[PDB]
Every structure is written in structure tokens, then in C-alpha cells.
Design a protein around this ligand. Structure first.
Ligand code: BCL
Ligand code: BCL
Ligand code: BCL
Ligand SMILES: CCCCCC/C=C\CCCCCCCCCC(=O)O[C@H](COC(=O)CCCCCCCCCCCCCCC)COP(=O)(O)OC[C@@H](O)CO
Ligand SMILES: CCCCCC/C=C\CCCCCCCCCC(=O)O[C@H](COC(=O)CCCCCCCCCCCCCCC)COP(=O)(O)OC[C@@H](O)CO
Ligand SMILES: CCCCCC/C=C\CCCCCCCCCC(=O)O[C@H](COC(=O)CCCCCCCCCCCCCCC)COP(=O)(O)OC[C@@H](O)CO
Ligand SMILES: COC(C)(C)C/C=C/C(C)=C/C=C/C(C)=C/C=C/C(C)=C/C=C\C=C(C)\C=C\C=C(C)\C=C\C=C(C)\C=C\CC(C)(C)OC
Ligand code: HEC
Ligand code: HEC
Ligand code: HEC
Ligand code: HEC
Ligand SMILES: CCCCCCCCCCCCCCC(=O)O[C@@H](CO)COC(=O)CCCCCCCCCCC
Ligand SMILES: CCCCCCCCCCCCCCCC(=O)O
Ligand code: SF4
Lengths: 46, 97, 46, 65, 336, 46
């Protein structure tokens, strides 16, 4: 799929991928903190 | 011993206690033509009468027995007392707390 | 339907699709987390 | 720094839930110190974070000036 | 969104903006329908205290009126359960069930408020049905807000605030307003009574002001009112600028505080665990437990006179000023 | 009926159609999520 970079500007796509994955990783980690069974810092029984 | 209550007593007059299901307030709102004292939740049969028994509306008074074919508009179904309590509190927590 | 890309710029269609898919999957995953039955990390019973 | 302090305290008040953060976005806040502290420095979770957020926010707007 | 037509009423002088606007299409019309009272049975013959083995509250009622009251209470609090909701099967002299002890307290409380709180309820009085409306539980009770013993070095300490709550009518206002005023007797006044400050005599904080605000949020939605029906908000702390509703609802606060502190909270010990709130407390009465969003509960229907047994005797100790207002003689030790 | 596209601009009609149909479809799906008999995630009785 090297042709994908003749459509999508690779420089902008790389930056927006890192920015987007930053939001998603922070969001998923925060969601796990909010749950009782997956907050590793709280240490509730599973 | 176990005197039977008077149908003309004020306690009976007030609740419409009638010795026979016929001659009752058949035009009273709370009334089905199957309600008898024996069918009443408030009725405890007497040990040695055969035809009478205690009535909880009369405080289970020994000298205020009721005929098993009687009726008052305080009748409640003996089909109750199967289930006691809020029907959503567990039985463990129902008694006392 | 190959002519669809002679009319619509491939980059804008793909960016539009990707934005819709990202928002939609986030919204579906969030809706599931909001329900008692399909909150997979809330760990409820059915 | 001010926005991070406010945002993290806001997020912490809803038990770190991003969903509950959106649900409560208009309602959450970094709360000022309770009256008993007067003008002293209160503990972080009792208005201390508010005082730091207010101090850095004041500094940023003054530098922006 | 709503739409016209809206019912409007004038609460203050023309041009003051003191008006009530109501949506007629938002009223339930079934929750507020008073049950049809039973026919008056005879009050002759011996009293209930002479007939019944275990009667402590309804001693001075006839046998007929005692059973009429018992059937009425069944319809009011547990129609779908029957007499065995409170009574242990066929042994009506038994006090085993917690609902029996609670209901015995509920009769004593119903008699107490009907005999002493005409300063709020006038002549309408209340019945088991005013609060229960045909349910085992009043739909409109409250529990204490949980107190989590904050970290003191962590983050996100809401001081009972900053969360949308149905207690505060979806504001970010303090959520513990009921505990402070409807069970406790904390001061509700926020306005200084002078033109110039005396900060060492009157220094109410804005947090205390928002707590009194949050109680007012409830007292408005709980009676289908708004701030204007009890106040001229331009001059909020002026009693002579307020309608007589403010004086009535003043006693509604002290009566609700009386109900919670002296009659409801003593029941907390013997409640089942399923019934208690998160803190482990009993459900308590707020303004909507009787009003359900209407100024006159059950459309102001006077149900008490139809049922002898729910009216007590006017206590010689009653003050309505001994609930946190110059004295605490009408409140027990605990409160909250 | 091809003459419809000598009247409208077909390129923008299709883009407008997708955005309108997306808004309507989310409108209907959310409305069913708010009803009781058609909330498939809630699973109330019918
Ligand atoms: C306790 C363990 C948690 C968990 C905790 C975490 C944490 C913490 C993280 C991840 C991250 C990831 N997890 Mg995980 N994860 C769990 C369960 C899952 C399940 C599942 C069906 O159960 C799936 C499919 C995933 C998938 C993923 C990936 C998207 C991602 C890792 C990058 C990758 O490998 O790309 C493979 C995937 C692809 C190549 C295609 C998908 C990529 C696209 C671009 C992302 C779209 C996501 C979309 C918006 C839906 C998000 C749903 C969320 C619940 C919000 N996880 C469980 C519930 N997961 C990381 C992340 O968020 O990266 C940014 C991360 O930091
Ligand atoms: C989600 C839709 C995306 C979008 C996706 C696409 C796609 C796919 C294509 C274009 C194409 C074009 N876009 Mg574009 N484009 C958008 C909006 C715009 C706006 C504007 C200010 O509204 C302008 C001036 C343009 C300009 C252009 C032209 C350069 C080009 C041809 C015109 C056209 O087809 O318009 C169509 C767009 C509109 C008429 C505007 C629609 C406005 C919508 C209703 C509101 C924004 C949508 C939002 C994300 C969700 C809406 C929900 C609510 C209803 C608001 N786009 C929005 C941001 N655009 C085409 C091209 O590449 O030419 C070769 C093409 O194939
Ligand atoms: C409530 C009972 C059923 C149910 C009853 C129905 C009924 C009835 C219908 C659907 C339909 C749909 N349902 Mg359903 N559905 C249910 C629950 C779901 C759930 C879920 C999480 O539970 C999901 C994800 C769906 C999903 C769907 C979709 C597949 C479909 C709507 C298509 C649409 O939005 O058209 C709107 C059009 C769009 C959204 C187009 C936008 C898409 C693209 C990606 C936009 C990109 C912009 C682009 C760049 C612009 C230019 C493009 C150019 C052409 C190049 N349903 C429940 C279980 N559902 C409908 C259907 O089948 O349609 C075919 C339908 O009639
Ligand atoms: C555009 C108008 C949309 C009207 C919504 C259609 C239903 C009307 C309605 O009455 O919806 C009501 C919600 O408020 C509403 O309308 C809310 C309507 C909001 C419209 C958008 C305003 C911006 C609830 O009513 P129900 O008793 O649950 O009705 C069945
Ligand atoms: C003109 C276009 C009218 C828009 C559609 C109207 C939908 C039908 C309708 O009339 O729906 C109305 C929604 O409001 C509304 O019209 C909102 C009206 C918005 C446009 C004016 C119903 O309002 P009410 O009965 O007061 O709600 C009280 C409760 O039931 C809901 O909280
Ligand atoms: C105009 C813009 C918005 C107004 C949308 C209103 C559309 C009409 C919806 C209500 C009419 C249908 C209906 O009748 O829905 C009723 C509820 O309406 C409700 O919540 C109303 C909730 C409706 C949510 C719809 C929102 C869709 C968003 C549209 C845009 C999509 C995203 C865009 C980006 C269902 O009632 P019942 O389940 O029996 O009651 C049980 C309880 O829910 C009590 O309410
Ligand atoms: C988790 O979040 C991340 C990190 C992802 C980012 C997100 C952040 C978000 C969403 C933040 C949201 C912020 C919002 C919505 C904030 C809302 C702010 C509002 C509405 C503020 C409004 C008014 C606030 C005022 C006016 C504050 C005034 C405070 C002042 C002026 C404080 C002054 C304090 C001083 C000068 C401190 C003095 C300290 C000294 C040194 C004197 O003490 C000894
Ligand atoms: C409002 C001030 C009330 C009046 C008047 C009466 N009741 Fe009540 N009752 C009230 C509350 C707030 C509660 C607690 C509800 C909860 O969620 O815990 C109760 C509770 C009872 C109960 C116990 C129900 C149960 O736990 O299952 C009973 C049996 C009961 N009330 C009976 C009762 C009767 C007979 C009343 C009239 C005489 C009566 N209540 C009046 C509030 C109020
Ligand atoms: C009647 C049911 C009321 C409604 C509706 C609202 N208020 Fe009220 N308010 C009411 C009373 C009886 C009192 C006196 C309380 C006391 O025990 O002293 C109050 C008091 C206030 C105050 C305190 C003012 C002061 O005396 O210093 C404020 C600030 C206040 N009320 C505000 C307020 C607002 C904003 C309301 C609408 C949301 C509102 N009240 C409604 C009775 C009633
Ligand atoms: C049940 C025991 C009640 C509680 C708790 C509260 N209220 Fe009440 N209120 C109640 C009755 C029976 C009545 C009389 C109805 C009638 O027809 O006269 C009232 C009256 C009021 C009023 C006056 C309404 C008017 O005169 O138009 C107000 C303003 C009012 N109630 C408000 C109110 C508030 C704010 C309460 C909580 C603090 C409250 N009430 C509690 C019954 C009961
Ligand atoms: C809870 C709300 C009750 C329901 C429902 C019913 N009863 Fe009751 N009953 C209740 C209490 C709290 C008491 C104690 C009375 C007191 O003042 O202390 C009673 C008492 C009786 C009695 C008297 C029994 C005796 O003391 O010997 C009887 C006969 C009685 N109740 C009958 C009865 C019937 C027939 C009911 C169903 C319709 C019924 N009760 C429901 C509380 C509650
Ligand atoms: C983020 C959440 C959303 C924030 C932004 C919301 C912005 C819109 C707010 C709408 C509020 C609302 O619910 O509105 C609804 C209530 C609908 O509002 C209306 O009906 C608009 C006014 C209509 C006037 C009709 C009469 C005209 C004059 C006749 C004279 C004889
Ligand atoms: C921006 C769109 C906001 C729409 C809000 C609709 C709220 C409907 C219920 C209350 C009405 O008013
Ligand atoms: S109350 Fe019951 S037991 Fe007593 S007379 Fe009536 S039906 Fe018979």
C-alpha cells in the first residue's frame, strides 16, 4: 500500500497519527482508571 | 369459658359481624359471595368448639368467638399470609431487620 | 462506479470516511460502555 | 500548567472517567479553598490546587499582557 | 422544549416580575388525585385498647374505626401486598416484621404532625397516602450524600459541589443541603441585615450561600414553585416584601426537620440493609415527599377528617421555634 | 430521470445527501435508544 502516500500527504499523516494516538491512548488508560476492576493504582480485587 | 360474641354488640355492629353469610351487607362494597369467617385471614379455629373460633378483629378474645359461617367487612383472604413483608426485602433481613 | 473517483478527490473522500469511522467507532464504543449490559470493563452480570 | 491542574482535578472528581467527564463537563470545577483557611495556603486537595491554578493563571495573563 | 399555552399566575405587584408560569401539560393528574374516603363507620362500643392484645397508638378508636384505619393504611402503603405487609401472617398481635415497627412509628408521626404543624399544613393535614401515594416507599425521599474522607493531597475534591445532581435540580450547587437544613438546623440566612459591613458579626461565605441556594432550588421544584413565589428577588431578605408562602414554607422547613430528626432517623437502626442509602442511612423526607411538585399536596384535599386515628393531641411542648431557631428543645441529640 | 443532474450539481448533491442521511440515521437510531420498546441495548420487554 505504498501508493497510499501518493494520495495522503505522508508528513501530515504521520503527525496526525501521533496526535490522534496520543488522545486515544490517554483516553483508554483513563477509562481503565475509572473502572473498578482495571485501575492498577487503586488495586481492587478482580 | 369461650363465650360467643353478640351480633348486636357494638363491636359487631360496627364491623357488620353477622352469624350467617346470608343477612350480611351484600350491598357493602367490600364483598364477594365466597367470603366466610373460615376463609378469613383473621380467623383462628377454636380447639373445642367445632363451629366457632377466635377473631383477630376482636383481639383474639376468648369471650368473643365468631361463627365459621359468619362475615364482617373486615374479612381478608386467608390466601394471604403465604407471603409476608415487602416482597423485595430478603427474608433474612425482613424479621427484626 | 470507478468513475466516482474522477469526480470526488480521493484524499477528501478518504479523510471524510476516516473521520466518520473514527467518530462512529468512538461513539459506538462509548455507548456500549454507557450501558450496563455491554460495559465490558465494568464487569456486570446479565 | 494552570489548565493541566484544573483539567486533572476536574477529571479526578469524576473518578477519571472520560465519559463521565463529558457528561459533567459544565458541572465539574477546581474548587476554591473552604472558608476555614482564610488567606493561608490550604492543602492541595482543599483548595491548594485551586490556589496554584489561580497563581499560574494570573502569571500567564500578566505575561500575556 | 415546551410550548404554549402556559398557565400564569401573579404573585407580586404588577411589573415586579413576580409571576408563576406552569405547563398544564406537565402535570401528572393521577399522582395528585386524593383517594375516595371510606364511609364513616361507627365510633361506638369499647375502644381498641380494650379489644386488642398489642395496640399502643390507636387506643382510643372504636373497633370499627380501627379496622377502617387498618384497611385504609393497606391501600395507602401496600395495596398489592395486603395486611401481611406489616403483620406476620395471621398473628396480628405480633411485632416481628420491621414494617410493623416502622408503621407504628409512622402512625405516631402522622398523628404528631397533624396535631402540631398547622403553622404549615393549616387544616389539610397529611395521611400515609400524602407521602406514599399507594407505594411501599415514598417516591421522593433522600439519602445523605457520601463523605469519602478526602486525600488532602490528592485531586478532584468536590466539596459536595461541582457535579450535576437531582438533589440540586441539576445545578453544580452543594449536594448536602438536605443534611444541613432538612435534618440539621444550620442557618439559612445569607444576607447581611445592615447597609455597611460588620465582617466580624456577619460573614456568611459564598459556599454557605450556595448551600442555601441549593435548598431553595429543591424547595422550588419540590412544590412546583419558583424563587418569585416566596420572594421579591430584588430584595431577597425582606420578609415584608415576600408573599405569605414564605412564612408558610418557613414552618415547612422546621416540620421537615422535625420529621427527619425526631421520627425518621430513630428508625435507621432497625431498617434492612437493602433499604438504606449508600451511607447506611434511612430514606428521609424532603419537601417533595409530600408535595410531589405541587403547592397543595394531593390538590389540597383534606383527607385527615375522614379518618379518625391519624390525628393526635396538640402537644404542650410544641414551639416550632425549638428546632435550631433560638433553641434545640424539639430536636433529639443526634440530628446530623 | 438522468436529467436531474442537468439541474443540480451532482457532486454536491451526493455530499449533501450523505451528510443529511447521516444526521437523519443518527436521529432515528438515537430516538429508538430513548424509547422503551425499541432500546435494543436496554432490552426491556416488548
Ligand atoms: C486492560 C486491557 C484493555 C486494553 C487497554 C489498552 C491501553 C491502555 C491501550 C490500548 C491500545 C490499543 N488497544 Mg487495547 N485494551 C483492551 C481491549 C482491546 C480490544 C478488544 C476488542 O478487547 C481491541 C480491539 C483493542 C485494541 C487496541 C488497539 C486499538 C490499541 C493498540 C494499537 C494496535 O495494536 O493497533 C491495532 C489496531 C489497528 C491497526 C486498527 C485500529 C486502529 C485505529 C486507528 C484506532 C481506532 C480506535 C477506535 C476509535 C475505537 C476505540 C475504542 C476504545 C474503547 C475507545 N484493545 C482491554 C479492554 N488498549 C493503545 C492505544 O490506545 O493506542 C493509541 C493503548 O494505549
Ligand atoms: C463532511 C463533509 C466535509 C467535506 C468533504 C468533502 C468530500 C468527500 C469532497 C469534498 C469536495 C469539495 N469540498 Mg469539501 N467538505 C466539507 C465542506 C466544504 C465547505 C464548507 C465551508 O462547508 C467548502 C467550501 C468545501 C469545499 C470543497 C471543494 C474544494 C470541493 C468541491 C465542492 C463540494 O463538493 O462541496 C461539498 C461540501 C459542502 C457543500 C459543504 C457541506 C457542509 C456540511 C453540511 C457541514 C459540515 C459537515 C460536518 C462534518 C458534519 C455536518 C453535520 C451537520 C449537518 C452540520 N467543502 C466538509 C468539511 N468535500 C469534493 C472534491 O474533492 O472535489 C474534487 C469531494 O469529493
Ligand atoms: C433499532 C433496530 C435495529 C436497527 C434498525 C435499523 C433500520 C430500520 C435501518 C437501520 C439502518 C442502519 N443501521 Mg441499524 N439498527 C440497530 C442498531 C444499529 C447499530 C448499533 C451499534 O446497535 C449500528 C452501528 C447500526 C447501523 C446501521 C447502519 C448500517 C444503517 C444506517 C446507514 C446510514 O446511516 O445511512 C445514512 C447514510 C450515511 C450515514 C452515509 C455516510 C457514510 C459515509 C462513510 C460518509 C462519509 C462522507 C463522504 C466522504 C462523503 C462523500 C462520499 C461520496 C459518495 C464519495 N444499527 C438496531 C439493532 N437500522 C438502515 C439501513 O439499513 O440503511 C442501508 C435502516 O433502514
Ligand atoms: C423539533 C421539535 C422536536 C419535538 C420532539 C418530538 C416529540 C415531542 C415531545 O413532546 O418530546 C418531549 C421532549 O421534549 C422535546 O420535545 C424537545 C424538542 C427539542 C427540539 C429541538 C430544539 C433545539 C417529551 O415528550 P413525550 O411525552 O415523551 O412524547 C412522546
Ligand atoms: C413550528 C414547528 C414545531 C416543531 C414541532 C413541535 C413538536 C410537537 C410538540 O408540540 O412537542 C412539544 C415540544 O416543544 C416544542 O414544540 C418545541 C417547539 C420548537 C419550535 C417552536 C411538546 O411540548 P410540551 O407539551 O410543553 O412538553 C412538555 C413535556 O411533554 C416535554 O418536556
Ligand atoms: C430537532 C432536534 C432534536 C429533537 C429530537 C427529538 C426527536 C423526537 C424524539 C421523541 C419522540 C419519539 C419518542 O416518543 O421518544 C420518547 C422519548 O423521547 C426522548 O427521550 C427524546 C430524545 C430524542 C433524542 C434524539 C436526538 C437525535 C440527534 C439528532 C442529530 C444526530 C447527531 C448529529 C451530530 C419515548 O418515550 P418512552 O420510551 O415511551 O418513555 C420512557 C422514558 O423515556 C420517558 O421519556
Ligand atoms: C485532564 O485535562 C487535560 C490535561 C487533558 C487538559 C484539559 C483541560 C481542561 C478541559 C480544562 C478545563 C478548564 C475549564 C473549563 C476551566 C473553567 C474556568 C473558568 C470558567 C474560570 C472562571 C473564572 C475563574 C476565575 C475568575 C479565577 C480567578 C482566580 C484568580 C484571579 C486567582 C488569583 C490567584 C493568585 C494571584 C494567587 C496568588 C498566590 C499567592 C502567591 C498570592 O499566594 C500566597
Ligand atoms: C412523609 C412524611 C410520610 C408519611 C406521612 C408517612 N410515611 Fe411511611 N415512610 C416515609 C418514608 C420517607 C419512609 C422510608 C422509605 C424508604 O425508602 O426507606 C417510610 C417508610 C414506611 C414504611 C416502611 C416501608 C419499607 O421499608 O418497606 C412503612 C411500613 C410506612 N412508611 C408506613 C406508613 C404508614 C402506615 C403511614 C401512615 C400512617 C406513613 N407511613 C406515613 C414517609 C412517610
Ligand atoms: C418557598 C417555598 C420558597 C421558595 C420557592 C424559595 N424560597 Fe428562599 N427562602 C424561603 C424561606 C422561608 C426562607 C427563610 C429561611 C430561613 O430559615 O430563614 C428563604 C430564604 C432564602 C434566602 C436567605 C435570605 C436571607 O434571609 O438572608 C435566600 C438567599 C433565598 N431564600 C433564595 C431563594 C432563591 C434564589 C430561590 C429560588 C430558586 C428561593 N429562595 C426559593 C422560602 C422559599
Ligand atoms: C408533608 C408532611 C409536607 C412536607 C414535608 C412539606 N409540606 Fe408544604 N404543605 C403540606 C400541606 C399539607 C400543605 C397544605 C396544603 C393546603 O391545601 O393548604 C402545605 C402547604 C405548603 C405551602 C403553602 C401552599 C399555599 O398556601 O398555596 C408551601 C409554600 C409549601 N407547603 C412548601 C413546602 C416546602 C418548601 C417544604 C419543604 C421544606 C414543604 N412544604 C414540606 C405538606 C407538606
Ligand atoms: C402497615 C402499614 C400495616 C398494614 C398494611 C396493616 N396493618 Fe394492622 N397494624 C399495623 C400496626 C402498626 C399495628 C399496631 C397498632 C398500634 O397502634 O400499635 C396494627 C395493628 C393491627 C391490629 C390489632 C392487633 C392487636 O393488637 O391485637 C389488627 C387486628 C390489625 N392490625 C389488622 C390489620 C388488617 C386486617 C390489615 C389488612 C387489611 C392490616 N392490619 C394491615 C400496621 C399495619
Ligand atoms: C451544548 C448544548 C447546546 C448549546 C447550544 C444551544 C443553543 C440553542 C438553545 C435552544 C434552547 C431550546 O431548548 O429551545 C427550544 C425551547 C425551542 O426554542 C424555540 O422554540 C425558539 C423560539 C421560537 C419562537 C416562536 C414564536 C415566535 C414569535 C411569535 C409572536 C406572536
Ligand atoms: C445544540 C442542540 C441543543 C438541543 C437541545 C434540545 C433539548 C430538548 C429538551 C428541552 C427543550 O427545551
Ligand atoms: S374479621 Fe375475619 S374472622 Fe373476624 S368476623 Fe370478619 S371475616 Fe370473620
Amino acid at each position: 500500500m505504498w501508493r497510499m502516500w501518493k494520495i495522503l500527504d505522508y508528513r501530515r499523516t504521520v503527525v496526525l497519527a501521533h496526535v490522534g494516538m496520543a488522545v486515544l491512548a490517554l483516553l483508554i488508560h483513563f477509562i481503565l482508571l475509572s473502572t473498578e476492576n482495571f485501575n492498577w493504582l487503586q488495586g481492587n480485587p478482580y | 369459658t369461650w363465650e360467643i360474641i353478640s351480633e348486636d354488640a357494638p363491636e359487631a355492629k360496627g364491623i357488620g359481624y353477622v352469624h350467617n353469610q346470608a343477612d350480611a351487607d351484600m350491598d357493602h362494597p367490600r364483598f364477594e359471595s365466597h367470603q366466610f369467617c373460615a376463609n378469613c385471614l383473621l380467623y383462628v379455629p377454636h380447639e373445642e368448639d367445632g363451629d366457632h373460633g377466635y377473631c383477630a378483629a376482636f383481639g383474639m378474645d376468648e369471650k368473643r368467638l365468631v361463627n365459621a359461617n359468619g362475615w364482617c367487612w373486615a374479612w381478608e383472604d386467608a390466601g394471604d399470609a403465604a407471603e409476608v413483608g415487602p416482597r423485595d426485602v430478603p427474608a433474612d433481613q425482613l424479621r427484626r431487620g | 462506479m470507478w468513475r466516482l473517483w474522477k469526480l470526488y478527490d480521493p484524499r477528501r473522500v478518504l479523510i471524510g470516511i476516516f473521520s466518520w469511522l473514527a467518530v462512529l467507532a468512538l461513539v459506538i464504543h462509548f455507548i456500549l460502555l454507557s450501558t450496563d449490559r455491554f460495559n465490558w470493563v465494568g464487569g456486570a452480570a446479565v | 500548567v494552570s489548565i493541566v491542574i484544573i483539567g486533572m482535578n476536574m477529571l479526578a472528581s469524576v473518578d477519571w472517567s472520560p465519559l463521565e467527564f463529558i457528561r459533567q463537563f459544565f458541572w465539574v470545577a477546581l474548587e476554591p479553598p473552604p472558608p476555614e483557611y482564610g488567606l493561608s495556603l490550604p492543602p492541595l486537595n482543599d483548595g491548594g490546587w485551586w490556589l496554584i491554578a489561580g497563581f499560574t493563571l494570573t502569571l500567564s495573563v500578566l505575561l500575556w499582557f | 422544549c415546551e410550548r404554549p399555552p402556559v398557565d400564569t399566575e401573579q404573585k407580586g405587584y404588577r411589573g415586579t416580575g413576580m409571576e408563576e408560569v406552569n405547563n398544564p401539560r406537565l402535570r401528572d393528574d393521577d399522582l395528585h388525585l386524593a383517594p375516595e374516603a371510606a364511609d364513616p363507620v361507627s365510633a361506638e362500643g369499647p375502644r381498641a385498647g380494650e379489644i386488642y392484645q398489642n395496640v399502643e397508638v390507636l387506643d382510643d378508636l372504636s373497633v370499627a374505626e380501627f379496622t377502617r384505619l387498618m384497611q385504609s393504611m393497606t391501600d395507602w402503603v401496600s395495596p398489592d401486598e395486603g395486611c401481611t405487609y406489616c403483620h406476620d401472617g395471621n398473628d396480628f398481635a405480633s411485632e416481628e416484621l420491621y414494617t410493623y415497627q416502622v408503621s407504628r412509628q409512622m402512625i405516631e408521626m402522622n398523628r404528631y404532625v397533624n396535631a402540631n404543624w398547622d403553622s404549615h399544613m393549616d387544616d389539610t393535614g397529611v395521611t400515609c397516602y400524602t407521602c406514599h401515594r399507594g407505594e411501599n416507599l415514598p417516591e421522593e425521599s433522600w439519602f445523605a450524600e457520601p463523605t469519602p474522607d478526602v486525600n488532602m493531597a490528592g485531586l478532584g475534591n468536590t466539596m459536595m459541589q461541582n457535579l450535576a445532581s437531582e438533589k440540586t435540580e441539576y445545578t453544580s450547587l452543594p449536594r448536602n443541603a438536605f443534611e444541613r437544613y432538612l435534618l440539621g438546623h444550620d442557618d439559612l440566612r445569607v444576607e447581611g441585615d445592615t447597609i455597611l459591613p460588620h465582617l466580624d458579626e456577619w460573614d456568611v461565605s459564598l459556599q454557605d450561600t450556595e448551600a442555601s441556594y441549593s435548598l431553595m432550588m429543591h424547595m422550588s421544584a419540590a412544590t412546583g414553585s419558583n424563587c418569585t413565589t416566596c420572594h421579591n428577588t430584588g430584595r431577597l431578605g425582606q420578609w415584608d416584601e415576600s408573599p405569605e408562602e414564605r412564612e408558610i414554607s418557613w414552618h415547612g422547613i422546621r416540620m421537615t426537620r422535625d420529621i427527619n430528626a425526631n421520627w425518621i432517623e430513630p428508625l435507621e437502626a432497625g431498617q434492612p440493609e437493602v433499604r438504606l442509602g449508600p451511607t447506611g442511612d434511612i430514606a428521609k423526607v424532603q419537601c417533595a415527599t409530600c408535595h410531589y411538585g405541587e403547592q397543595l399536596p394531593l390538590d389540597g384535599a383534606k383527607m385527615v377528617d375522614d379518618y379518625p386515628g391519624l390525628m393526635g393531641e396538640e402537644d404542650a411542648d410544641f414551639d416550632f421555634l425549638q428546632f435550631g431557631d433560638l433553641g434545640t428543645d424539639g430536636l433529639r441529640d443526634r440530628n446530623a
